[PDB]
Design a binder for this molecule. Structure first.
Ligand code: EQ9
Lengths: 245, 58, 297, 50, 58, 58
C-alpha cells in the first residue's frame, strides 16, 4: 500500500513496486495564482496537458568513486517540448514540479543516496584556493542544462554550507536494500508571483552518495541513475518573440 | 490609536500589543508574538501519514 | 458557454493552497505522561524507515517507563523577534583628516548588512525575510574621545544624485530625509520601513539580473537582484572648510516586526567577499572538531 | 497519601493470576462432524508453523 | 481641545486628526488628509461629455 | 498591564503593587510586601506542643 505507487499526469504514467511514501515539499501542494497576489493584467494561458507531463532528462552512472551531482530547475526543460517553446515566447512563468528518481540494484548491492531540493542554491567558487583571488562561476555551471553538472567539493556543497544539514530541506534517500526510487512534489517557491524561466533558477536538485556503492565481481557494475520530472499548474504571460537566452 | 497600517506584519494571522506615538506603525515596538508551531511542515510532510505503533512499510 | 465536460470537471483556476498541516499553540513544552510496560506484537514504535525523509515519532513514553511531569518551560525566547531584535554592527564610515579613503570630509556607504558575520550568519539561516528596522549611529574619534562637531546624514535612495563633494548642492535635502546631529549629544536613532518592490528580502538569488550573451567579463552580476539595493547613506562634516578632528561612524541595525521563510543550512567556512558565497578551497576546515578513535573519547 | 500518579496507575499489589485458558468438561471424546470438499484459497489448515 | 481655529485649512471640506499642546492650531501637526481625486477637472473638462465606445465626433 | 510574568516572585502567596513601563516584570519596582510572620517555625517546631502554664515535662 505504501510500497506500490503509480503516478498518472498527462499522457504519461509511472509505476514502481519497491518505493516509499510521497513527499510534499514544505507541506503544501501547487496552485494557480490568486487575483489578489497577482499584479499583471494580461490573461495567462494554461495548456494543462502539453506541459504538465513527465519529461526524462538524462541517465548518469554511479561508480564507487562518485561524488555527486546537481541540476537547476526549471532550466532543465527550456529546450524540451511545448513547455520550452512557450517559455521562450513568454517572459513570465509560474509552475510546480513533481520529481521522480530511479536507481535499481539487486539484493547483493549496497549504498545510499540523498535526494534534496534546495531553493536559491547559489554556486560559489574557491577564490583561487588562496582566498584572495576573487572569481565568479561561469555560465555552464549556473545553467548547465539537462546534462547536469558534477560537484567537486560535496562536503560543503560548493557553497560553504555542509551537507549534514541538507535534510532540513525536502529530502529522501535511496537505500538499495529497502527502496529503488524517490518521489518529491514541490510548490512554486519565490517571493514574486511570476518570474522569468531563463534568467532566474528557483531551486536545485542534488544527488549525493553518502555510503558508497559496493559489490563483488561477477555482478553487474553499471548502476545508472535516471531523473524524471513533471511540471504542474503551469502559467505563462507576456507574449513576444522567442528568446533562446 | 488612529494610525496607519504601514507595518510589515499587516496581513499576518497573529495578534500583537505595542506602544507607539508617531502615526506610522513601523515605528512601533516589536512586542509579543503569538506562540505557535508547526513541526509537521518540516518533520512529517508526507502525503499518507502513518501511525506510531504500526510500522510504516506494509 | 462551457458546454463540454472536461471544462466543468477541470482543476484549472484554483487559487487555494491545499495545506496538509495546520499550526497549533505551544506556550510551554509538552507534559510527559505516565507509562508502563508493554509486551505486545505489531506495536513497535522504535522501528522507523528514514528513507521516506520524515523524522521519527518515538517518544519517552513508548520506549521506557516514565512518570508524570507538568512542564512549564516557556518557548517564548526561541521566537524570531526574541532572536533577531538585538542590535549588531553592520557598517563603518571613516572621515579622517588626511589619508586615502575619504579625506575631503564626505563619505558614501552602500547599504549592505553583509559585511560582518555575526549578523550575516543569523540571517543566512533563512532565505526570504520581511522586516522593519531601527538603525543607530555612534560617532567618535579613534581614541573614543568626544568632540564638539556638527554632522549631517542623508539617505540617498536609488536614482537620486549622489554627492561628489562637501560643498555640493545635493545636501539641501528638500525631498530626501536627513539627520543633523552633534557628538556631544547621544546617538542618533531612527526607524525604517520595508522598502523593497518585492514581498521579501532574499539573501540568496540564483540567477542573473539581465538578459544577454553572458560572457566571462559580465559574470560579476551573478547573484545580484536590484530589489535589495535599497540605496546609499551619505555623511559629512558641516561647513565650508575642513574639520579640526578625525571621526569614525558606526552603524547598528535592530530588526523588528519580522517574518521569515525557507530554512536552509548554515555557514561553516570563513567569509571572504560580499554578495558572493565563495570559500577558500585549499583551506577547507571541517564543520567542527576531531579526535583519534571512534572507539574512544 | 498516594498523591502522585505513577502510584495510582501502578500494577503493584496484584494477587490475581491472569489465566488465558479455562477448563471445560469432557465426559466423552469429541463427536466427529460431517464435512465436504472445499477448493478455496486463503483457508489452509494444513500449513502450520511449529 | 478648547483651542482656536487659526489653521489655514479652516474652511476645507476634509477631515484631519492632529496632536497639539499650544492654543494656536497652526502649531499642530500636519496629520492625515482625506484621500480624494478629481481628474475630470484637468483631463475631461468638456461641456458635453462623450461615451468611451461611441466615437466623439458625430 | 499586559506584561509578562517573568519576575522571581511569580508563584508566591503574597500580593504586591508595582510601577512598570517595560514589558518585562523583572524591571518593575520592589514595592510593598505582605506583612506576615511564622516564629513557630524556628522557635517552637516541636511535634507535641505544650501549654504556657503547665510545665512541659510530665
Ligand atoms: C536619515 C537617515 N535614514 C537612514 C536610513 C539608512 C538606510 C536605510 O535602509 C536600511 C535597509 C536595510 C537593508 C537590509 N538588506 C536587505 C537585503 N540586503 C542585502 C544586501 C547585500 N546582499 C544581499 N544578498 C542582501 C540588505 O542589506 C534606512 C534608513 N539613516 O539616516
Amino acid at each position: 500500500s505504501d510500497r506500490v505507487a503509480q503516478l498518472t499526469i498527462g499522457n504519461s504514467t509511472i509505476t514502481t513496486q519497491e518505493a516509499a511514501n510521497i513527499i510534499v515539499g514544505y507541506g503544501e501542494w501547487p496552485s494557480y495564482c490568486s487575483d489578489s497576489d497577482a499584479t499583471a493584467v494580461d490573461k495567462p494561458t494554461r495548456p494543462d496537458v502539453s506541459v504538465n507531463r513527465f519529461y526524462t532528462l538524462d541517465t548518469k552512472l554511479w561508480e564507487k568513486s562518485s561524488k555527486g551531482w546537481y541540476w537547476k530547475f526549471p532550466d532543465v526543460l527550456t529546450e524540451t517540448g511545448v513547455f520550452g517553446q512557450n517559455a521562450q515566447f513568454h517572459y513570465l512563468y509560474r509552475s510546480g514540479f513533481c520529481i521522480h528518481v530511479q536507481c535499481n540494484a539487486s539484493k547483493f548491492h549496497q549504498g545510499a543516496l540523498l535526494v534534496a531540493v534546495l531553493p536559491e542554491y547559489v554556486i560559489g567558487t574557491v577564490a583561487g584556493g588562496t582566498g584572495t583571488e576573487d572569481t565568479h562561476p561561469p555560465y555552464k555551471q549556473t545553467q548547465p542544462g539537462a546534462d547536469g553538472f558534477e560537484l567537486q567539493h560535496p562536503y560543503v556543497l560548493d557553497a560553504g554550507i555542509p551537507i549534514s544539514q541538507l535534510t532540513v530541506c525536502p529530502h529522501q534517500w535511496i537505500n538499495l536494500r529497502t527502496n529503488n526510487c524517490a518521489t518529491i512534489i514541490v510548490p512554486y517557491i519565490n517571493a514574486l508571483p511570476f518570474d522569468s524561466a531563463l534568467n532566474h533558477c528557483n531551486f536545485g536538485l542534488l544527488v549525493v552518495p553518502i555510503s558508497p556503492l559496493d559489490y563483488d565481481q561477477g555482478a553487474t557494475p553499471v548502476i545508472p541513475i535516471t531523473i524524471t520530472l513533471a511540471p504542474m499548474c503551469s502559467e505563462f504571460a507576456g507574449l513576444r518573440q522567442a528568446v533562446t537566452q | 490609536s488612529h494610525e496607519n497600517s504601514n507595518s510589515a506584519t499587516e496581513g499576518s494571522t497573529i495578534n500583537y500589543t505595542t506602544i507607539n506615538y508617531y502615526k506610522d506603525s513601523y515605528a512601533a515596538t516589536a512586542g509579543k508574538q503569538s506562540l505557535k508551531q508547526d513541526p509537521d511542515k518540516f518533520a512529517n510532510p508526507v502525503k499518507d501519514i502513518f501511525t506510531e505503533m504500526a510500522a510504516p512499510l506494509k | 458557454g462551457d458546454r463540454v465536460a472536461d471544462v466543468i470537471e477541470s482543476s484549472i483556476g484554483d487559487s487555494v493552497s491545499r495545506a496538509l498541516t495546520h499550526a497549533l499553540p505551544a506556550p510551554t513544552g509538552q507534559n510527559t505522561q505516565v507509562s508502563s510496560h508493554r509486551l505486545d506484537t505489531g506495536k513497535v514504535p522504535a522501528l522507523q524507515a528514514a528513507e521516506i525523509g520524515a523524522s521519527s515519532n518515538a517518544s519517552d513514553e513508548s520506549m521506557i517507563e516514565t512518570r508524570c511531569v507538568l512542564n512549564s518551560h516557556s518557548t517564548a525566547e526561541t521566537t524570531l523577534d526574541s532572536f533577531f531584535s538585538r542590535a549588531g554592527l553592520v557598517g563603518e564610515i571613516d572621515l579622517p583628516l588626511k589619508g586615502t579613503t575619504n579625506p575631503n570630509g564626505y563619505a558614501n556607504w552602500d547599504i549592505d548588512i553583509t559585511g560582518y558575520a555575526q549578523m550575516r550568519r543569523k540571517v543566512e539561516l533563512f532565505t526570504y525575510m520581511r522586516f522593519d528596522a531601527e538603525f543607530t549611529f555612534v560617532a567618535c574619534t579613534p581614541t573614543g574621545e568626544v568632540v564638539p562637531q556638527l554632522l549631517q546624514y542623508m539617505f540617498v535612495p536609488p536614482g537620486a544624485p549622489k554627492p561628489d563633494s562637501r560643498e555640493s548642492l545635493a545636501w539641501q535635502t528638500a525631498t530626501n530625509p536627513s539627520v543633523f546631529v552633534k557628538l556631544s549629544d547621544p546617538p542618533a536613532q531612527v526607524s525604517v520601513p520595508f522598502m523593497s518592490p518585492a514581498s521579501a528580502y532574499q539573501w540568496f538569488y540564483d540567477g542573473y539580473p539581465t538578459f544577454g550573451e553572458h560572457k566571462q567579463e559580465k559574470d560579476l552580476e551573478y547573484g545580484a537582484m536590484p530589489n535589495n539595493m535599497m540605496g546609499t547613506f551619505s555623511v559629512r562634516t558641516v561647513g565650508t572648510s575642513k574639520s579640526k578632528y578625525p571621526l569614525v561612524v558606526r552603524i547598528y541595525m535592530r530588526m523588528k516586526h519580522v517574518r521569515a521563510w525557507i530554512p536552509r543550512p548554515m555557514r561553516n567556512q570563513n567569509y571572504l567577499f560580499k554578495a558572493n558565497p565563495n570559500y577558500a578551497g585549499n583551506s577547507i576546515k571541517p564543520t567542527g572538531a576531531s579526535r583519534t578513535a571512534i572507539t574512544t573519547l
